[PDB]
Every structure is written in C-alpha cells, then in structure tokens.
Coordinates of C-alpha atoms (C1' of nucleotides) and ligand atoms in Angstrom, one line a residue:
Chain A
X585 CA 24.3 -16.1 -46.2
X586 CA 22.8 -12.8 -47.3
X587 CA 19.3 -11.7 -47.7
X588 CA 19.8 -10.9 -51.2
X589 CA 15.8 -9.5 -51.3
X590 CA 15.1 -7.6 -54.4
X591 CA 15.3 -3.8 -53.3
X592 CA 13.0 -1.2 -55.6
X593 CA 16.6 0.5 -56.7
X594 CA 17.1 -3.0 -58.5
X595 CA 20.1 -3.6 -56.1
X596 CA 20.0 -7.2 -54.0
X597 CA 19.7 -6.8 -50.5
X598 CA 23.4 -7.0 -49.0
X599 CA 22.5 -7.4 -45.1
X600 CA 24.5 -9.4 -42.8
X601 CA 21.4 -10.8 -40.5
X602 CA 21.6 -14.4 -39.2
X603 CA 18.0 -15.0 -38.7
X604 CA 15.6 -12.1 -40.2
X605 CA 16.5 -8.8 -42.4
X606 CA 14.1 -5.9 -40.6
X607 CA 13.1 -4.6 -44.1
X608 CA 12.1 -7.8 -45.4
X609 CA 11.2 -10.0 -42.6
X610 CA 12.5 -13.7 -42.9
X611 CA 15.5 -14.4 -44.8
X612 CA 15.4 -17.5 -46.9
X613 CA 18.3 -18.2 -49.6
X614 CA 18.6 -17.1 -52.8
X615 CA 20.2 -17.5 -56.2
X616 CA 22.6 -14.5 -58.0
X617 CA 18.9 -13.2 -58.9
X618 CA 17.4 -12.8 -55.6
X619 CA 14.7 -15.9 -55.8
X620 CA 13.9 -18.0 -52.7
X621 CA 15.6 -21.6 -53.6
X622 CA 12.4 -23.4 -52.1
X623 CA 9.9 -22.9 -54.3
X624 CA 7.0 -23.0 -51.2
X625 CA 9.0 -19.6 -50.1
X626 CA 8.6 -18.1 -53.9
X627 CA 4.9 -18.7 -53.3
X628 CA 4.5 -17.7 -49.7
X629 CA 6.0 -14.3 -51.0
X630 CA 3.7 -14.1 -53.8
X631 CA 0.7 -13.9 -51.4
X632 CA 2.3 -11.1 -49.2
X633 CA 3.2 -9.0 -52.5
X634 CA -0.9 -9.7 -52.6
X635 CA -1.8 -9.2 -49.1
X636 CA -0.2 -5.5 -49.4
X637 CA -1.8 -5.0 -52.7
X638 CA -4.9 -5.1 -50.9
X639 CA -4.3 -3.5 -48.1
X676 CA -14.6 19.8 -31.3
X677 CA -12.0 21.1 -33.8
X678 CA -9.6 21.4 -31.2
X679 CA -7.5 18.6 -29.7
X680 CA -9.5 17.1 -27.0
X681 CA -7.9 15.9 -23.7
X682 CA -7.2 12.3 -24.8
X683 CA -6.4 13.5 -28.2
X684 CA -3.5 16.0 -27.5
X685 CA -1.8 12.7 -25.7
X686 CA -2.5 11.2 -28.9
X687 CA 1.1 11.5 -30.4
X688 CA 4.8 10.1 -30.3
X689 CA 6.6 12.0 -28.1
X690 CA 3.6 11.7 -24.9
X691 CA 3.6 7.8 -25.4
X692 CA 7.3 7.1 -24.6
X693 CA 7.0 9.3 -22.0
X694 CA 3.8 7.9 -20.5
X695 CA 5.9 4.3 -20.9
X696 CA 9.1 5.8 -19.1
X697 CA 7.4 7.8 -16.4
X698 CA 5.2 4.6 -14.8
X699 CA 4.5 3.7 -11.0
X700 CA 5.5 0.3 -11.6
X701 CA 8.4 1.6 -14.3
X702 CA 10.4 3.7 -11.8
X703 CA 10.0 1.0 -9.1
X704 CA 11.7 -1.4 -11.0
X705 CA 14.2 1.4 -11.8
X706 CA 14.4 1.3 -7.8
X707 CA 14.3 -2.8 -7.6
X708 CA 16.9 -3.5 -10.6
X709 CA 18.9 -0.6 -9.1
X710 CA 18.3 -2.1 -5.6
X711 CA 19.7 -5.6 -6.9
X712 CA 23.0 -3.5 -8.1
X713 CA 23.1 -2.3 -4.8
X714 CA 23.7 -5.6 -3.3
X715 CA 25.8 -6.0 -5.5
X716 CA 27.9 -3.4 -5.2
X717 CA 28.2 -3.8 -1.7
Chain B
dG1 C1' -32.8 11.5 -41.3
dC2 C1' -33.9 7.2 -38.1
dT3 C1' -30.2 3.2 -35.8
dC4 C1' -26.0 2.0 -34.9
dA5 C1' -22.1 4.2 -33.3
dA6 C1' -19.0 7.1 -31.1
dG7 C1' -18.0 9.2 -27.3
dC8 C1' -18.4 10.2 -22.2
dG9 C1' -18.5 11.2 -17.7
dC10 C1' -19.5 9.0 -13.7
dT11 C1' -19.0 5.2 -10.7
dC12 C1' -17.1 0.7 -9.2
dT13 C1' -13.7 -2.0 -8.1
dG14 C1' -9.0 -2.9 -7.8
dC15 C1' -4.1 -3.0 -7.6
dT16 C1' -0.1 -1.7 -5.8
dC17 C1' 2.4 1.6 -2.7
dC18 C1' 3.1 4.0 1.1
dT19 C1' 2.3 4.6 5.8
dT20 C1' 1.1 3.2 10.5
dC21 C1' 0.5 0.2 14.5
dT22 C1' 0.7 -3.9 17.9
dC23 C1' 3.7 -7.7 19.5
dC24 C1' 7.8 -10.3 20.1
dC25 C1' 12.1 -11.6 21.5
dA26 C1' 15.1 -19.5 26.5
dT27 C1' 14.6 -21.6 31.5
dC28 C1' 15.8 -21.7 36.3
dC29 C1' 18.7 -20.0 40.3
dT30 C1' 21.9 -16.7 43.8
dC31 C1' 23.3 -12.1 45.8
dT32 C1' 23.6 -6.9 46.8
dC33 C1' 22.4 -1.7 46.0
dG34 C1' 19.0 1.8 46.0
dA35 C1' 14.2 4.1 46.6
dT36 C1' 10.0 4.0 49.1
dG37 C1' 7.4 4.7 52.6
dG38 C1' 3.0 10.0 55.7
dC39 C1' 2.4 10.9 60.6
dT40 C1' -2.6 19.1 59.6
dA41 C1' -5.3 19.8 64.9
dT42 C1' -9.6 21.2 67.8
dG43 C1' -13.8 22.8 68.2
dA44 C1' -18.4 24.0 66.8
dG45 C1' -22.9 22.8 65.1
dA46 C1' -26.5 19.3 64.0
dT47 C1' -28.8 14.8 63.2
dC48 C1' -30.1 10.1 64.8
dA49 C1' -30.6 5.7 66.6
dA50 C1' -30.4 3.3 70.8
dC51 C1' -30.5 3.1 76.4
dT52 C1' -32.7 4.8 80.6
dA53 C1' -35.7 6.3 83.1
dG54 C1' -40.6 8.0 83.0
Ligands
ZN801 ZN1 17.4 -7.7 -46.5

DNA sequence: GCTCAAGCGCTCTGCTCCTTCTCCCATCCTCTCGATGGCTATGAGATCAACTAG
C-alpha cells in the first residue's frame, strides 16, 4: 500500500508507512487519483480540510528559558533523568558482569 | 478607564535522594593460656560523746 495523499506540487504521496504517513496522519487507500476508497474517509477528510481552514521589554527570567534549545536541555539534565541514566546503566552492569 | 486578567513573589508542602545511625547475627558443653591483682608512714592538733569519779 502507499499513502498516495494529494501533495500541493500535484505529486501523490509515494511513502512506504505501514500504519500512518507523518505528513498526512492516517493512511487509508486510494485510487490512481489519490481518493480514500471508503467514502466515510473522503468525508472525515473534508472536515479536517475545514477544521484547518478555521483555525519589561527585556526577556524576563522565565522567558529567556522560553526557547528550543533550554527545553531539551531542561528534559536531558533531570534528577530523576540522570538516575535512571544510573539505574538502566546499573541494570547493564549486571549484566555485564 | 473600571474588572477581569496576568503576573508574581512568597510560602507550604512534598518528593525523592543522599547521608547518617542503631542493631543484629543457633544452642549447649569441655579444656588450657594469659593478665590481673596494691600493700606511703607517724605525728601533731582539735573536737566530741561517753565513763568515772566528784
Ligand atoms: Zn503520505
């Protein structure tokens, strides 16, 4: 199967995913013009194409961590993070021994 | 320009981690080997309460 989704360059989607195509969600079959067999999936797209239709000066304390790069770092660098860097590596251990 | 918001710092848990601290480790029996263990004097003053008379 392919997800065959109608990409804005005109070209159908040619992703090999089993279950779901990241750029267009779920992936539901499709004839040679890239329209969902089941005509409750032609519809269901419908209302998402609808849904998205309608859809001091300085940087403060809280707001200079506001970004990308302080978020994965605030994720990585945890208390409970690097002990179970220590407990899975711990588990190796055992392992390895 | 008059009310809901947006924040906001301060406080209250609280949640887990790390550290620290006390206890605990079968029963009974025999024997030997060692260690240990303390031992100033003698006299002077002065008080006091009990006999021994008065
Ligand atoms: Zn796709």
């Amino acid at each position: 199967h392919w997800c065959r989704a109608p990409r804005p360059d005109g070209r159908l989607c040619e992703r090999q995913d089993r279950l779901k195509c990241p750029f267009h969600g779920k992936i539901v079959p499709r004839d040679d013009e890239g329209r969902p067999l089941d005509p409750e999936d032609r519809a269901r797209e419908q209302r998402r194409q609808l849904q998205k239709q309608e859809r001091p000066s300085l940087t403060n304390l809280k707001a200079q961590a506001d970004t990308a790069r302080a978020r994965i770092g605030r994720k990585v660098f945890a208390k409970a993070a690097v002990r179970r860097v220590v407990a899975a590596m711990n588990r190796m251990d055992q392992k390895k021994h």
